[PDB]
Scaffold this active site. Structure first.
Site, mmCIF file in Angstrom:
data_model
loop_
_atom_site.group_PDB
_atom_site.id
_atom_site.type_symbol
_atom_site.label_atom_id
_atom_site.label_comp_id
_atom_site.label_asym_id
_atom_site.label_seq_id
_atom_site.Cartn_x
_atom_site.Cartn_y
_atom_site.Cartn_z
ATOM 1 N N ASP A 37 9.076 -6.938 -10.673
ATOM 2 C CA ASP A 37 8.364 -7.786 -9.578
ATOM 3 C C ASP A 37 9.275 -8.985 -9.079
ATOM 4 O O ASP A 37 9.417 -10.014 -10.133
ATOM 5 C CB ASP A 37 6.991 -8.204 -9.813
ATOM 6 C CG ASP A 37 6.292 -7.040 -9.931
ATOM 7 O OD1 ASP A 37 6.747 -5.725 -9.783
ATOM 8 O OD2 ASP A 37 4.892 -7.031 -10.190
ATOM 9 N N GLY A 74 0.806 -1.277 0.232
ATOM 10 C CA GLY A 74 0.084 -0.007 -0.034
ATOM 11 C C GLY A 74 0.871 1.363 0.036
ATOM 12 O O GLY A 74 1.782 1.307 -0.595
ATOM 13 N N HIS A 90 9.850 -4.872 -5.154
ATOM 14 C CA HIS A 90 9.934 -4.030 -6.160
ATOM 15 C C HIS A 90 9.819 -2.634 -6.159
ATOM 16 O O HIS A 90 9.401 -2.366 -4.743
ATOM 17 C CB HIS A 90 8.603 -4.702 -6.982
ATOM 18 C CG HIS A 90 7.404 -3.739 -6.594
ATOM 19 N ND1 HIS A 90 6.724 -3.831 -5.450
ATOM 20 C CD2 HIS A 90 6.339 -3.116 -7.396
ATOM 21 C CE1 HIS A 90 5.873 -3.269 -5.333
ATOM 22 N NE2 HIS A 90 5.384 -2.743 -6.538
ATOM 23 N N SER A 140 5.577 -5.452 -1.515
ATOM 24 C CA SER A 140 5.932 -4.038 -1.573
ATOM 25 C C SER A 140 6.186 -3.561 -0.275
ATOM 26 O O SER A 140 7.265 -3.679 0.448
ATOM 27 C CB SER A 140 4.694 -3.415 -2.008
ATOM 28 O OG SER A 140 3.678 -2.665 -1.082
ATOM 29 N N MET A 141 5.291 -2.699 0.401
ATOM 30 C CA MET A 141 5.381 -2.045 1.893
ATOM 31 C C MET A 141 5.478 -3.233 3.054
ATOM 32 O O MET A 141 6.188 -3.187 3.892
ATOM 33 C CB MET A 141 4.232 -1.153 2.236
ATOM 34 C CG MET A 141 5.016 0.289 1.656
ATOM 35 S SD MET A 141 6.228 0.955 2.690
ATOM 36 C CE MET A 141 7.597 0.985 1.509
#
Lengths: 189, 68, 190, 190, 188, 190, 190, 182
Positions: free
Chosen positions: A169, A66, A120, A95-96
């Protein structure tokens, strides 16, 4: 979400399962990281620090990621508090989510056997005049540089290697994440 | 160890600190184990055998019966 | 929203996490600043002043911005109450959120290490006749003047410099914000 | 969602049907497996392990399927907790639902007589550049390989045969699932 | 909306109920029929609560229905407690009307507050006769608003008509000069 | 849903109307049969069997039908639990509801006088390649075969006649349903 | 809606604002008149009559209008209950709201100083065959005649004058409502 | 609104055995009404139940379920027509016990043939039309039985929309007497 009722001499305690886990110092990160979730998690971490500043806090992560600012707020709260924060990856950390998974205490970052970790470069968007697009691009590049710096400091890998790996990714299993330094050990049943 | 710690912590939330400060000792009773229950059955059976022997009735209980 | 059960000699009480923080005189500003959020913040500040008027009040800021008038209401309430209001920037403090960050008491404005703040001129819109557009433009320019004046008075920087820097989106790190005068010092980890 | 006031001793507290069933170590999975449902299931499993580390947990499964990662989280939590978990197939256990049905304790996987199970390859999508499509295809193929390997381990069947059978949607009755090895025995009525 | 615990009564309130206990009524949204009904109910309950003490109206609203504002005005003027009006943030359209409808000498405004006075909005649609009726009604409503504002501010009705023709934005000092408020609350 | 209050020997307790009926072991099926409703009904049945395994359970069916999987899940749960399940038709019992109408214990399948029941062949759909459509059609035909078999066993009627009467929509009155075998007796008013 | 504390001598009772107003026999009609609102008003009137059939009931009206049938149900319930019902016009009373305003007891209908009362013929619509349009038009004309009859009865004005004045939307002030006969007297401020 | 003495207003009315039918008669409302009727029968099976009807109609199956529940329970059911009663609502108004169906002075009732729909092949349309005709025949038969009117006259009046006021409801046999104010 089920409700748990605990009986004492003083009275009745009606927890929901997430609050019951929070009673045992378990914080659940199981949704997209937006402002509301980050605020709730920061408040939970602060309250858990207040209740006892010496025991360990457990953070369970299952999220596609997010907002970068929300993840940075969570990271700052984790690093600022005196008690150690154990991060356990259940399901997904993308991600986060992976950034917060790596943000746990050293020797205390775990992942379930068939869990998946994805790293990523951050997503964003610029629109408008050329100067505004330049400002947005500079900001996103600065944010990527900061994330790469923290990841290099926290995983022991060079900034160049993380720059190369995060271009696309990258999907890592628990063993690959342990080899990459994102987590510390896989939790054997 | 953790069970004793958490029961003691829960006890503090039900009584005043100055009430617990005046108690000489707070003792936590552990849960009965398998062999402890077997010994309890043995002791009750021994008491009953004595009480029936004073009436001149001789009784013996096997180990499997006591375990059951 | 998690629920917190806290045991006390008076009894056992059920809190939600935000009200539990509010018990410790902590106010969470973590959404877009609209009329409802500003009303809630003003009410919380007024109640905290009513409870007792000498201890500090802590404002945790994580917002992307919002209405100028709501932020002005919050700032006026902050300046009017006797107890000092500490502002700590969590995550992002942008638009009127950054303006409220500088509104904290001198020596008591905080920001986390990897926190970001953003300052720019306010947005707006005008529709209709030329006279109506003129009225709306005059209003937005006057609002910009007032915001720039308050920022100059709170950060110690010249009105011209804040005018230049708020022309576009200016993203500042915690160290850049400290050197700019927005915050007083960053919160070192402990 | 009807409520139930039936509780022992005092009998004052009221439960909904699912919370009351949770006290009897009954866990209901009657919807698609997304992140929220998986998180709830994991929390319930941890709570039931804490309540007693020896007694068995009852998992009633009725799900068209869902996210593979959510099912993996549920599978890891099931295989990690000390207490055994019984999987009872209600209606249909398809896609990841069938995977969780095979995740129960060995000799403790059951299915109702007129129940249905389905096994197939994971669904997905890939959009963007050729490199991005290649990455997504590699990921989905590795996910299918891992699912097939886990199914082969938990069913005692060759991964070639599972690969052949999961090519298309394979519908199996309770008896056919028993012969295949996903379940252990069909719960005959009383 | 946070939950508030009062330590002197070991009793729980929400923040708005806690404020209403101190005779604080908050108008912090668009004024429609539901909001006006709630405000009138709160005013009547507070009048029942004590015949003497003052009621406080904190206004932060862009405006709304003229009829709801008239209901609030009538309730404020009918009840015999004095109703103090404090401008928090924005007092625009019917909100500025209720700002000047408070007790004389008890109309306050925060330093960096802004008010807006303008003619009421509306619309008409249909045959010529129906549109004429709607126009007559809106003109009469504007006339009544101008009359009440001139009475409560002391300024001529012609000047209010001239100033309210367009959107008039006034600062706290400018509202003090105009007559809508009485003085600006200086911080301690 | 009105709140319902009684004064018991243990004091005055309140319920909603559906929870009050569930206290007397009355289960209401008054909506479409999807996975959520099936999950709720199965949970209620399991709770009632845990409460008392000898007494009877009552199922008031007013449903237009629903999914075949959910209906089969409810049917399996009914036939699995030890306590008997009386079935009373209120208003309409169509499609899967009529199947659940016949699921009740023999001699305990009732229907209101001017109530209507209706039996269908199961609906469905197929899309994709020719092989996928073949698989879907095979599944639908086998599901219909299972439905016809269970209906023949419970109603004591030939499979061929069920095929004939099921090919098209078949509206049956309570007397016609009783003669057909779906219900055992019409509830004469008393 | 806000919650208030009451009974300074008892202090332990807290009600919602409308429940508190209902304690003093105040019923609020402050929304568009549909079936649910009419049902709530009728139930409140019945409960108030049951609690004390001697004291007077107060009805506050602020409504743009609503359905003719629901307002007629309110009118019937008002006219059937033994206790008197006072009607006060807060804000506006338009369409059948003014009809209910005139429905109060003789000599007990009040309106606020700056309150507007609007009277007009009822709205409607017909769509279909010529016979159906004729039926709908006849019903609308009949209900308009019934409204005119009741208004003439409770206002003392000739039905021809009401027919002429209700042709279009007639907006009246409190003074004009008193002169016309809708209200008894304007509530002069204290 | 909450009624304090605390109960919601409908719960308080149910304590006086007053059941409100004031919305579209769909499956949810029918189930609620049936459950309330069963509870009122169980709580005390000797006093009388009061049903207030204000509804534009709804499902025929739901209304028939409510009718069956009214007929089956031993305690009687007085029906008072508040406001409107149309299609199935008028049917349930006629479902009240003899001598105890009520209507407020200027209340209105509607009787008309049930609405339906058909779509698809000719055979499917035929099945749907046959079912609709059978349902109309059942409705007309029950109305004739419960109003003492001939089947043919009910068929004739039901063809188009038929608005009946309280007095026309009286001479039609739908209600038993109008409630005079007191």
């Amino acid at each position: 979400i089920p409700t748990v009722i605990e009986t004492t001499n003083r009275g009745e305690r009606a927890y929901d399962i997430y609050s019951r886990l929070l009673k045992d110092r378990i914080i659940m990160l199981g949704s997209q990281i937006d402002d509301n979730v980050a605020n709730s998690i920061v408040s939970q971490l602060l309250f858990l620090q207040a209740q006892d500043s010496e025991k360990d806090i457990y953070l369970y992560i299952n999220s596609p990621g997010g907002s970068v600012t929300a993840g940075f707020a969570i990271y700052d709260t984790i690093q600022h508090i005196k008690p150690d924060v154990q991060t356990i990856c259940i399901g997904m950390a993308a991600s986060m989510g992976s950034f917060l998974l790596a943000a746990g205490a050293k020797g205390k970052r775990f992942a379930l056997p068939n869990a998946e970790v994805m790293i990523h470069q951050p997503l964003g968007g610029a629109q408008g005049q050329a100067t505004e697009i330049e400002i947005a691009a500079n900001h996103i590049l600065k944010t990527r540089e900061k994330l790469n710096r923290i990841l290099s400091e926290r995983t022991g890998q060079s900034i160049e290697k993380i720059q190369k790996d995060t271009d696309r990714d990258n999907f890592l299993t628990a063993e690959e994440a342990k080899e990459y330094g994102l987590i510390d050990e896989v939790m054997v049943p | 160890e953790t069970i004793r710690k958490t029961m003691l912590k829960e006890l503090k939330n039900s009584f005043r600190p100055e009430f617990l400060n005046r108690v000489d000792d707070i003792i936590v009773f552990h849960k009965l184990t398998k062999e402890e229950l077997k010994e309890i059955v043995t002791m009750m059976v021994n008491k009953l055998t004595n009480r029936l022997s004073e009436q001149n009735i001789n009784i013996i209980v096997t180990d499997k019966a006591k375990d059951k």
